[PDB]
Write a protein that binds this ligand. Structure first.
Ligand SMILES: CC[C@H](NC(=O)[C@H](C)NC)C(=O)N1C[C@@H](O)C[C@H]1Cc1c(-c2[nH]c3cc(F)ccc3c2C[C@@H]2C[C@H](O)CN2C(=O)[C@@H](CC)NC(=O)[C@H](C)NC)[nH]c2cc(F)ccc12
Ligand SMILES: [Zn+2]
Length: 103
């Protein structure tokens, strides 16, 4: 069974892509990578949200993988779990935050 979707209007990849009209060229993550991972542009800075879980992410850095960030921050997202599988999410959740030594 499928649970709630926060934003039905953005459930399609094409709809999410259309939001990235004014995506800043300086950001080292591309609209297609974001849209594929469920994200659409909110229209300010580099803020995006997931159509399913309504999780917002910003301050995208060089080397960021939207699927990994999705799983790092919103592991309970149903779209994420169905697209990537629970094992992907669990792996990401076991990996981050990186271990710091001392206790
Ligand atoms: C940087 C780490 C993280 N980014 C990354 O890891 C990137 C990929 N890779 C390195 C990130 O973006 N996060 C981590 C989570 O925390 C959620 C998100 C930050 C965020 C919060 C987000 N997540 C939180 C977690 C908390 F425990 C406390 C507050 C927050 C917030 C709100 C932040 C903190 C403070 O409230 C001000 N604030 C704002 O968004 C202010 C900015 C003017 N503006 C507003 O409120 C407007 C009007 N409404 C939202 N709200 C958002 C809304 C968005 F559309 C986009 C991102 C956010
Ligand atoms: Zn999500």
């Amino acid at each position: 069974a499928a649970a709630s979707i926060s934003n039905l209007s953005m459930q399609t990849h094409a709809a999410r892509m259309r939001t990235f009209m004014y995506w800043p060229s300086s950001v080292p993550v591309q609209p297609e990578q974001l849209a594929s991972a469920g994200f659409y542009y909110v229209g300010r800075n580099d803020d995006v949200k997931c159509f399913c879980c309504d999780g917002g992410l910003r301050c995208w850095e060089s080397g960021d993988d939207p699927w990994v960030e999705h799983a790092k921050w919103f592991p309970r997202c149903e779209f994420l779990i169905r697209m990537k599988g629970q094992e992907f999410v669990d792996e990401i959740q076991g990996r981050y935050p990186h271990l710091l030594e001392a206790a």
